[PDB]
From a paper:
Here we report the use of “Build and Retrieve” to define the composition of a raw human brain microsomal lysate. From this sample, we simultaneously identify and solve cryo-EM structures of five different brain enzymes whose functions affect neurotransmitter recycling, iron metabolism, glycolysis, axonal development, energy homeostasis, and retinoic acid biosynthesis. Collectively, the BaR approach was then used to reveal enzyme identities and solve cryo-EM structures of these brain enzymes with resolutions ranging between 2.69 and 3.40 Å. These enzymes were identified as glutamine synthetase (GS), ferritin (FT), dihydropyrimidinase-related protein 2 (DPYSL2), glyceraldehyde 3-phosphate dehydrogenase (GAPDH), and retinaldehyde dehydrogenase 1 (ALDH1A1). Interestingly, malfunction of these important proteins has been directly linked to several neurodegenerative disorders, such as Alzheimer’s, Huntington’s, and Parkinson’s diseases.
Author numbering:
A (entry chain F), B (entry chain G), C (entry chain B), D (entry chain A), E (entry chain E): 3 to 372
The structure:
Amino acid sequence: TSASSHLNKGIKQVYMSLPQGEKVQAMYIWIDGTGEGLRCKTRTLDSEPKCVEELPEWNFDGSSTLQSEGSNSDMYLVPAAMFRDPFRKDPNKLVLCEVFKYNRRPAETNLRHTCKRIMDMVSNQHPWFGMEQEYTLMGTDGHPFGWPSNGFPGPQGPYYCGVGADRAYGRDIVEAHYRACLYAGVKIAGTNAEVMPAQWEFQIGPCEGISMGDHLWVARFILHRVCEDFGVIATFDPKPIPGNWNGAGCHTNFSTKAMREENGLKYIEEAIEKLSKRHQYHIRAYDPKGGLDNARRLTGFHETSNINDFSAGVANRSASIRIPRTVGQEKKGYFEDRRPSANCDPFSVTEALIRTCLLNETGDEPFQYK
Amino acid sequence: TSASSHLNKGIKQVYMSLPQGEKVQAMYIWIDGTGEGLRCKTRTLDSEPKCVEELPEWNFDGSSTLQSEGSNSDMYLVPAAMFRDPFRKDPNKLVLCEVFKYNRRPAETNLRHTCKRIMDMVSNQHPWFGMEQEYTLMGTDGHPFGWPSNGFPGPQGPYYCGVGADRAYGRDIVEAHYRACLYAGVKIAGTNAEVMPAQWEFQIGPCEGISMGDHLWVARFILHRVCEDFGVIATFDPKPIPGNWNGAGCHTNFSTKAMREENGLKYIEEAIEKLSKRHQYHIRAYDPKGGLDNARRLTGFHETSNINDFSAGVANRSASIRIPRTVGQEKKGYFEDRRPSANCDPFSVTEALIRTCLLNETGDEPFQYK
Amino acid sequence: TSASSHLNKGIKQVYMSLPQGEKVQAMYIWIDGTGEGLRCKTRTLDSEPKCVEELPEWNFDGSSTLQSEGSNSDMYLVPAAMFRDPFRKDPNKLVLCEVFKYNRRPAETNLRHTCKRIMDMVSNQHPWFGMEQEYTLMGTDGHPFGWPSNGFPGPQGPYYCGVGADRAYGRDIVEAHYRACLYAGVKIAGTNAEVMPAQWEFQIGPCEGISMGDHLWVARFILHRVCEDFGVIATFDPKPIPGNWNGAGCHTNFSTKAMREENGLKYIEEAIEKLSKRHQYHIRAYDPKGGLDNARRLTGFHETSNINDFSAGVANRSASIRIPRTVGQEKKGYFEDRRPSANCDPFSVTEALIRTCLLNETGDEPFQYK
Amino acid sequence: TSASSHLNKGIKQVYMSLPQGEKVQAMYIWIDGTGEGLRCKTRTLDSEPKCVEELPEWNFDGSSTLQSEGSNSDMYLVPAAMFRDPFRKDPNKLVLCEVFKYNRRPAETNLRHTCKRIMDMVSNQHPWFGMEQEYTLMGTDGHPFGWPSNGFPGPQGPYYCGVGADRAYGRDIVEAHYRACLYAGVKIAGTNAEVMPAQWEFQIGPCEGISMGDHLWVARFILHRVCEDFGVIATFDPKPIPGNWNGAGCHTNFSTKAMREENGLKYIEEAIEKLSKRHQYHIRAYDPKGGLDNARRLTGFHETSNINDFSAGVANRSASIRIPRTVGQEKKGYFEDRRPSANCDPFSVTEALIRTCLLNETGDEPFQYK
Amino acid sequence: TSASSHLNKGIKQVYMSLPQGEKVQAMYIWIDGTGEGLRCKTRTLDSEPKCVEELPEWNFDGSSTLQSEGSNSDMYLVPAAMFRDPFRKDPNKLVLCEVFKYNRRPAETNLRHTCKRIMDMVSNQHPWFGMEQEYTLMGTDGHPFGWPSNGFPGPQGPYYCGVGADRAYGRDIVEAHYRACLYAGVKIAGTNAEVMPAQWEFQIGPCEGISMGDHLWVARFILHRVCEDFGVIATFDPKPIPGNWNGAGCHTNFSTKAMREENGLKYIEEAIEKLSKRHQYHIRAYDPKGGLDNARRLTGFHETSNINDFSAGVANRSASIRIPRTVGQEKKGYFEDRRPSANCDPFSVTEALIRTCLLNETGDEPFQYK
Ligand SMILES: [Mn+2]
Ligand SMILES: [Mn+2]
Ligand SMILES: [Mn+2]
Ligand SMILES: [Mn+2]
Ligand SMILES: [Mn+2]
């Protein structure tokens, strides 16, 4: 649908075929001032970097990305995680970088820095996270891909986990994204079509601590890039189409070594009790705009929790926190926080799960730790 | 967008697959009478040339390229640099050739010849150059690629270092160009999307002396050829679209062994003082038309230096010469001359940096040396 | 949408402008063997016919219209009613003709002949009828006009009696049909958009006895012809689109001089009691296929009576027979039989209302009268 | 852009040419349950109605228009005003009808009934009203007409009161609407292009009392119908396009005989003082959703009053109430309330101006009068 | 080419057919802050205005037209001239209005006010003016109408005064404009195709004094409006296409009663001598930007005077001022000033011809008169 997609791709492929030689390419990817966005730039490295630590720091213009004022626009990218590059193949890498200010203080959307400190405090207990990112592939026009033009597809029902031309739209984009994630090392755990047509879900898990955020952000970047080649645009909006068509939510699974260990459902239920008390804090933490975006998806209908009221159940698809029945039967496992929106920053959601359940924080403001 | 792009490219590829045998192809590339343009022609060589010196001299009709009068139209190409050919692969080569007149005097746009002499005088001090060529991919119609037809894209902001179908236009062309440069041996140091949509930057660094000009010219040639296959046209105009959309400028980094060496920021600042004094000379040297073109980009707005007034700062994105903060902290490094336009001849810009800073020249006219 | 519609209509108009002279054209229109269809043919008459009686009888091939076997295929058209011709203007006429068999016995779909006898028996009591024919304009593809392609329009709601490009589809066809009916002398009483998009209703009445059938059939013919010029196709199917989108039903209003006269609601309610007893007979009489077609529309949902169960109420939109509240308040008026399908033959519906309510018939078979 | 627009219009015109005869058509137009919408249906009248009183009452299904529950869905249309029909010409009429419930109580969106009572109380003082309705013509896709596809038109500036193909979009629709209003008798006082491209304003006035609302509603209906024929859709949304492009607001001019009479600016300023006190009441009254819609347009930028703060000035384009300088110089005249949104119900805005300024009401609830 | 042009025009025509009744429409047209532009708005007048004096003054927002600051944005339109309306026919009028500031001082682009005073001083001598406005019809894309796409038409030569599909482009627009001017009362004196393809010339003559400016401005407005209906855009740029294709210039003929009277060529030549002395003043007065625009057209090639050097000849097409040979033979007549650009404000050009030749002014600044 995009002009770029229309460009002959065979041509680009023959250039990709050419041996690149000793020089290696690293894409430096960083979160935007908006906080939902991702930006990227490429540098040439003389030799393949064995580890993320080896990769050099780089700088970018903050004013263009809306992360700083003109007077000291420069911002610094510090490599945080390194993944293989699906797009260019090995030795090329994709680097996720924390953004730092001109004065070397973590940037406003560098939520990894605070989250990383929080994960380190609770590293002994091995908190693990899984997330279930939901997205709709929408053409350049902004209307979902494959929907009739100036129209709506047939009644909702056949599209969930659908097969066939009519049932599923953008499977190729999904297939490419999934393989690209495997090649990159992003821990994709599976994919499924979603109830809304043209809407899919990709789940990353089980990552441990800060890794969850890194993997999801890289997965999202991979999705956007794969989508760009096809010409479609992935959207993480909580309610992509207004109406009865389903909204997109990123349901975070959370477990700790104690919960996973036998008779750990006591821990699962203790965590849930803490979550209920800080529900306002969680809703704000879980989406970039503080809950306006999350509220659109969370209408209390279409199997979504109401955003006003916290709820917990076992095998209750709708309630804000659902313990799977199997986890309950096993008396050990994980619970699924279903409040986070699709546009949620993973670092915030993980950090808030740790802060509320493991660090036992109380009150609206996040704690400051020595 | 071009008719040629519409031709089936698979067909051409099957011919490229055919083994070419012992014979080797050399593209002889030379600068136009206009001085911004590049022209090219191909010859068959019995065996692969090991070195540029081996390559034979060739001649071309100057009247067609607007480099000489009809009476003695013939001009001579002398191979100057040799690169591997990305388009046809090895053993084929791309040759950049100095243009000489019928009377064997360097041609008017053979600025390499004078520059090479200047580089040789200062070879002991190892001046190194980096440049940051900016360009906009524009369709055959002349309107930037991917912009709405008879329209303008959404407000400036999301496109800088952007990812996704909406944010970036012509990434495939950029990817192909970058790989082609690596294969050719052009020293590409990285690439980034630019603030304007459909505008990108490719940086060649760090080359030493005359090499900088050769690499950039070959890089530009590679870009034009890659663009031709896709059907888009790269433009190096200083202000490709008139209005608030950003102009394209080639910011030249300059260093010398002394500046690079510890406590070399004294040298960096001495060079800057000299640059300020010859600002008129630099502006004229830095663009083909003497500053009319450069002035359009350099309005003193959109983070560009005013073309009337020289300015210098540390980490001052806008000022004509910016020392990176990191270079200042290290007390050694390079400074970034930001006055040169995208259409600048690299040989002129390098030569003028040497002449002003290293040779300590004074006055409007360039010096004549024994 | 049809190829014929694409033909330049200005050209046809200049021929229509030409004076036709003394000769007059009469379109002879007759019901098909199927009974839902209408067919037509044109003859030239030396002078304008003042009355229907003057018009000459004509014959047609029954085998082509599926009304008789090959051995005695000829069938005879006897002019029954005459209307002015909207399409060609005066003096040209549209003639509705009863179809008679080769042996001069009324044809199987010549339901007017039996109905006319029934109306004549009850002529003293002046039964009047009103009908509300509903139809959907559907392109040559068979999908309703203006609906997205391979898609469905927005949720039902805004389209009923709608104004604006989005709300109403085929208003021009409706406007032309309405004016054509006025010119022809069809007693069109009004028009409204219907709940389903692209679906409209036209009301004919108040008519008297056999006239109701004649007017409706001519109105339908006019609609089909007007639609043909636009290229759309009108459909009288009971359930044009399968699903929650509304079906098309022709609700017959019925009154008699006694009911209309003050304190005539006793008569209205006596008629309704008789209607309830012969509900099976009515359902069969009211549609061509005996109730299979009617059943699709009459699901007992979307404000339609269930086809299995008779119901009567006052101002009960859904019940099979509704007395308007105003009629009830006035203690005189008409009741609305809502069981007849859009594809109903009017002659059958009127005849069955007379037979059940006025002639007080009992039993499945229609009575035979001396 | 709509499928209906693509249908040949010449054909419809030849049917319109046919003489319609004695029978006359009346379009009964009524406000929707939403309150922004308008719906319409047509009936045939034996003779032209000389006055609105002559026109018969009619009924419609409230459930389809979302004005009543299914049990007593019927609602009643009582003719309120009569206008000539531009679409079908004389003798045909357009009728604006108040909507009444099944129990004969004014419907929820029958705001004319309460307003009419209020106007009658103040009839002695002759309040006159003038409203500037603003609207954007937007294609079936929902993007404004003539804007580049998936794009934005050139910077705002040239389009206000513009001439030429580039400057003005949908002038034909505007021209047709204006003439149609004149023919109908709607008191159009002028038209101008608006700052946003594809956005126009049609001003109605000076009408007196209840007439103001009737004329505006009929004008809006005429606009929607004219737009439907062209295929475009008029929108009265307060902020049709989100961003710096201008929103659409219906600025109202209020005067009374006293204000108009010499040295009446004291009255103009007394009214303004009262308006300031009931600003919350006015904002709620002035738009259907209570101020959410109005707030989007009223950002306090682009020459619009902030919706949070009341402001008054003389010749202050931006302030909520502006007295024209000429009115101030004359010491007599009208003031312009600029708070009402484009989607405002006129009956509400007029009624609230009377209630606050003339009836001197105090408090959130509207008064109940014997 | 414009979307608006694609809208069915037959529909608009049927609305135009409707009788408009007693009310009359007046388009108030005024010059933009840029000074090349024209803007327009419509008002309803109860009765046809017999004279321009009768027409009411109106006001508009200066900030939108870039004529004043926000604090006192209001500007006032005072009707100056009245013409019949070709677009809506009689009684509707087109009004050209002088623009006045909030403080009632003539606006910056209200050059008529100063010019009118100058004409009045010399009214006794009856200066007459003729002008020859040249324009190119260019599609919405900005490339001249009928030129090949991304291409150039055949060599210049056949297009001047051409006939046939290949030779002339936009004759229909020209024909409509010419008739519209006749109907309006604009004094069109003729039309011819121009050397460049798609370029035409319309000449308004001979008007006296201030009338010349009024007629030309109204003619230009009529052209823009006629062009808008067709979808093309007229351009008055001095050099519409860069290259050898001809530029558009408005050659002003000037005469006075004395020059016209026998043996008046002495006066014609005295005026020319004065013109030569104030050549700098004339070049600045003759175009909006002070000569940058005029210089592009006036290259001293393609039969245009060089803008640097004044020249005068008899029957010398190229020289800045040409006396026609016939005028010279007659020893009486007019001379043709060929320096003014197509985008010239007529009021400025006339005023400067009067000031230099008739008022015998000397020096760069225009004189101030009691
Ligand atoms: Mn799940
Ligand atoms: Mn930089
Ligand atoms: Mn009904
Ligand atoms: Mn205003
Ligand atoms: Mn001439």
